[PDB]
Amino acid sequence: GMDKQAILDNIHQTWQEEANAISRLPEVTSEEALVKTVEKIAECTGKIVVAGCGTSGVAAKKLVHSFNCIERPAVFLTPSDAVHGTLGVLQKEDILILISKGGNTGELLNLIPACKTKGSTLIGVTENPDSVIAKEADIFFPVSVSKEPDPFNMLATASTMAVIASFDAVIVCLMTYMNYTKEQFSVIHPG
Amino acid sequence: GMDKQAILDNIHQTWQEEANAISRLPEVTSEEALVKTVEKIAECTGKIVVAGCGTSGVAAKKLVHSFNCIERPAVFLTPSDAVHGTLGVLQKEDILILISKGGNTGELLNLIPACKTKGSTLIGVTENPDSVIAKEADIFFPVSVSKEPDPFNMLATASTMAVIASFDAVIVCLMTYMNYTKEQFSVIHPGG
Amino acid sequence: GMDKQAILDNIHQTWQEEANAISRLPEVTSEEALVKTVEKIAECTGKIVVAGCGTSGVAAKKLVHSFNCIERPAVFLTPSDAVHGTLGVLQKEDILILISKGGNTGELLNLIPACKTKGSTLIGVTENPDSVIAKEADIFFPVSVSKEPDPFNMLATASTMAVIASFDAVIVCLMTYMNYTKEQFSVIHPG
Amino acid sequence: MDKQAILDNIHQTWQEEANAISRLPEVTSEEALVKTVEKIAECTGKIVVAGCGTSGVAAKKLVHSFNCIERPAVFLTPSDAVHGTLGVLQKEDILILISKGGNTGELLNLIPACKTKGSTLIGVTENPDSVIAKEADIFFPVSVSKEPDPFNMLATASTMAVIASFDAVIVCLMTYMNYTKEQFSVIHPGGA
Numbered sequence: 001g002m003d004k005q006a007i008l009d010n011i012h013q014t015w016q017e018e019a020n021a022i023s024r025l026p027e028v029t030s031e032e033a034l035v036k037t038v039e040k041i042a043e044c045t046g047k048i049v050v051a052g053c054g055t056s057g058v059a060a061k062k063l064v065h066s067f068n069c070i071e072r073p074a075v076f077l078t079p080s081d082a083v084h085g086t087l088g089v090l091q092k093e094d095i096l097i098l099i100s101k102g103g104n105t106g107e108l109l110n111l112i113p114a115c116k117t118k119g120s121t122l123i124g125v126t127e128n129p130d131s132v133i134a135k136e137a138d139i140f141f142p143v144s145v146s147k148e149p150d151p152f153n154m155l156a157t158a159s160t161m162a163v164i165a166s167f168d169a170v171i172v173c174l175m176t177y178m179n180y181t182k183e184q185f186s187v188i189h190p191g
Numbered sequence: 192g193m194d195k196q197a198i199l200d201n202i203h204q205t206w207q208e209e210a211n212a213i214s215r216l217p218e219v220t221s222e223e224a225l226v227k228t229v230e231k232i233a234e235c236t237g238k239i240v241v242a243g244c245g246t247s248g249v250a251a252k253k254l255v256h257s258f259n260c261i262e263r264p265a266v267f268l269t270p271s272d273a274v275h276g277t278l279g280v281l282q283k284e285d286i287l288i289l290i291s292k293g294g295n296t297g298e299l300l301n302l303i304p305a306c307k308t309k310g311s312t313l314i315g316v317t318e319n320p321d322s323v324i325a326k327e328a329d330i331f332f333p334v335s336v337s338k339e340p341d342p343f344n345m346l347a348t349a350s351t352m353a354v355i356a357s358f359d360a361v362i363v364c365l366m367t368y369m370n371y372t373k374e375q376f377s378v379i380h381p382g383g
Numbered sequence: 384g385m386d387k388q389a390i391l392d393n394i395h396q397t398w399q400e401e402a403n404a405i406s407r408l409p410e411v412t413s414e415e416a417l418v419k420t421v422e423k424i425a426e427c428t429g430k431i432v433v434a435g436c437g438t439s440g441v442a443a444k445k446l447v448h449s450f451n452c453i454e455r456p457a458v459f460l461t462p463s464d465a466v467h468g469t470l471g472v473l474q475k476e477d478i479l480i481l482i483s484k485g486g487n488t489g490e491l492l493n494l495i496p497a498c499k500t501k502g503s504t505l506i507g508v509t510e511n512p513d514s515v516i517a518k519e520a521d522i523f524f525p526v527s528v529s530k531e532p533d534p535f536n537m538l539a540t541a542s543t544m545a546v547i548a549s550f551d552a553v554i555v556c557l558m559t560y561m562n563y564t565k566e567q568f569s570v571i572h573p574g
Numbered sequence: 575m576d577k578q579a580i581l582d583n584i585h586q587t588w589q590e591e592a593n594a595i596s597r598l599p600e601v602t603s604e605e606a607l608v609k610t611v612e613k614i615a616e617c618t619g620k621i622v623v624a625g626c627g628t629s630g631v632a633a634k635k636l637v638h639s640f641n642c643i644e645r646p647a648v649f650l651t652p653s654d655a656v657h658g659t660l661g662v663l664q665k666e667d668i669l670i671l672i673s674k675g676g677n678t679g680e681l682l683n684l685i686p687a688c689k690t691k692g693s694t695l696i697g698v699t700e701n702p703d704s705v706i707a708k709e710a711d712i713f714f715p716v717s718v719s720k721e722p723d724p725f726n727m728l729a730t731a732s733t734m735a736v737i738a739s740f741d742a743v744i745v746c747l748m749t750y751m752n753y754t755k756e757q758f759s760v761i762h763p764g765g766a
Contacts, residue, residue, distance in 0.1 A: 073280045363538065570660070
């Protein structure tokens with residue numbers, strides 16, 4: 001079993017590796033993609049539609065929340081509903097963001113034909129430049145981590161955190177870019 | 192603690208009461224509101240934002256699903272997130288639909304000032320014409336039921352079906368109004 | 384185009400068909416399945432896990448909501464997350480309810496192996512007795528509709544209502560079966 | 575803004591977020607970290623997590639990851655909770671409330687039901703004098719000293735600090751409970 005010191009040591013390692021993942025973001029992201037993503041979102045006259053499965057889905061919901069907080073309308077597209085009609089939420093003026101670590105997640109690949117038919121901008125958020133999501137995207141948004149803290153290297157905790165951080169930076173940058181105001185914030189944050 | 196026939200008799204009563212609730216819709220809804228709702232949604236160049244609490248929130252999700260299915264973009268607005276920033280999803284060209292049986296649900300009333308500031312069209316779905324939602328709505332969409340099948344008269348099962356059915360009709364009508372095609376349906380229903 | 388009376392007639396026909404679908408529930412459902420479901424849920428010491436796609440997913444959320452309202456803990460299992468880890472919510476003492484009209488929805492068939500490994504009770508809510516969901520279910524819960532109100536016979540509006548109505552009756556019956564009180568309701572309905 | 579101004583803004587945000595996670599040992603409680611691991615390992619019910627807005631997304635992250643390690647978990651939506659969904663919470667469960675300031679009204683409304691039901695309350699907040707911190711069975715402190723947004727309002731670093739805190743708890747649980755690849759494989763079959 002695990003005593004107090006073993007628990008805390010284990011915990012300290014997970015934190016070190018998660019901080020490392022974020023601090024290393026310039027080494028795993030694309031400067032061009034970061035700039036193009038900021039400009040494209042600032043200029044968007046529609047909404048941001050974000051899809052992901054499991055932990056990528058949670059990251060997706062984080063993007064959706066924070067984009068709405070800065071007056072960039074955004075919605076979560078649930079893949080199991082998307083292919084049964086909720087793809088109707090996606091429109092021509094929108095930006096579809098697909099979050100998949102490996103870039104070949106079947107549930108998201110099923111959404112690409114509709115995106116192409118509708119004319120939406122596709123932003124592929126993945127570690128794999130050879131994946132369908134990276135290749136089909138209008139903006140390939142590379143993001144990855146060199147080390148995952150879980151004993152199997154299967155939970156994708158640092159990966160998830162790296163995606164959230166990437167978009168946190170985009171969203172914080174947009175507040176300056178679009179001259180976002182406290183007045184606008186108060187309208188949508190009354191409590 | 193109750194026999195087969197007691198279970199079946201209890202069940203049949205609920206279905207009869209729910210069937211009655213749906214069949215009475217022409218009596219509890221407004222003809223003007225039905226037509227104005229069809230027209231306004233058909234003409235909408237933005238999206239449909241729907242909010243509700245508890246069972247009303249499940250009704251809202253049904254509207255959201257079915258509107259998207261007919262190429263009327265729609266999103267559910269979670270009241271506990273809405274007032275903490277997700278109200279940014281609501282824009283001028285949108286239609287905000289608030290579903291509240293009583294019409295004074297505080298969690299939804301908190302969304303009205305932002306709706307008014309943004310200039311969105313407000314559809315108020317409620318039984319109470321004297322409610323804040325009814326009074327503040329651009330389209331007051333009355334819907335009600337005369338008997339809930341549960342023993343407390345509190346579960347709101349019939350009320351919810353009446354709301355869902357009300358919009359199922361609007362949505363089915365929209366498919367003919369807008370000349371919605373099987374080609375459009377196939378793009379957004381490719382399957383797994 | 385369509386004038387006012389054309390709009391009203393179209394609307395009226397949809398309600399006539401939906402009400403008929405509900406009134407016909409005794410002839411499209413199984414008396415043995417209805418009784419077995421009430422009894423199994425009343426005896427459940429775990430929670431109810433309900434999954435569905437698109438319109439069937441909204442029906443699933445209605446069940447989840449109304450079960451919780453009568454002190455039957457329930458959770459919605461999103462199929463696009465389920466196969467990426469959220470099947471961990473499902474345990475031995477639980478009841479899994481799969482809602483699928485045709486009963487062969489791939490996103491749900493992918494959840495059956497885990498249900499079998501886990502030892503949970505499976506309730507299959509479908510119109511097709513020859514479907515995988517029907518055949519694999521511990522309780523096959525037939526439900527169907529003869530006529531759908533939409534012009535394509537593809538929206539499944541009446542089918543969704545029939546499914547919701549079926550469980551509303553199960554839930555209402557459970558209030559009496561289990562001697563549910565307004566005191567218990569008041570605790571979980573302070574709003 | 576030119577290319578370099580964008581990149582400088584972005585890099586500053588990542589620096590502050592990395593710092594927020596690196597400082598977790600100073601802003602968390604060792605006693606709470608250990609008690610939370612032990613309590614969750616011992617839990618025979620499920621983990622119910624509630625939050626509003628960004629705290630809600632953090633709650634959903636906890637819920638996903640707990641499920642991934644065979645610790646059943648469910649998100650409790652505050653606008654549904656007080657309208658019947660509080661019935662999901664049972665005596666053998668652990669309620670986790672995530673609120674930065676610790677006084678979010680939507681969550682405070684959930685505490686009386688938690689006390690009546692006898693569940694374990696974990697209060698995740700920066701504020702030790704808040705209701706959530708004072709009412710909790712385990713007060714789980716988490717805070718950040720620098721928020722990267724120009725208004726000090728988006729709570730991006732705060733959210734990340736909360737997620738990272740429970741990521742560590744969860745990763746620690748895999749070893750603590752002897753979680754296997756075989757268990758992982760059952761609940762991660764994929765979409766194919």
